[PDB]
Amino acid sequence: EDLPHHDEKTWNVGSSNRNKAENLLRGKRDGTFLVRESSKQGCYACSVVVDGEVKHCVINKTATGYGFAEPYNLYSSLKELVLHYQHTSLVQHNDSLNVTLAYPVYAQQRR
Incomplete structure (x- = not known):
């Protein structure tokens, strides 16, 4: 089946303020997350x-960054x-x- 992860809109909300993210993270059961920025910085973080x-989990954006680099994941893309x-x-x-x-x-939730 198609995975909603393919679309950034499903998890990415844009540069929404962190306080607004709390509302998005408030009322959501464990497992539900979203992708946003650290705010005005060019860094990315998945909450x-x-x-x-x-x-709020922070995502790095460097050849060896992306976030986790100890496991050598070497993510090709976000x-x-x-x-x-x-x-x-x-x-x-x-x-x-x-x-x-x-x-x-x-x-x-198309169907």
Whole structure:
């Protein structure tokens, strides 16, 4: 089946203010996340909701950046980065971030 991850609108909301992201991250079950910027900076960050609390994950934009570089993921594009975290549980980095980028914050829900 087509994966909503292909469309940035499903997870990308644009340069929305972080406070507005809280509303988007507020009322969303764990697993639902969105992609935005650190605000006025050219950096990117994926914010997700965890069964425990809402957190803001930062994404890097460098040949070896993209965010995670210890695993040598070498993401070819940001689209793969969103899907890769879908299968990887954030639990790492505190062992308490048990969540994956499996649900988009703006799923079209065509049917």
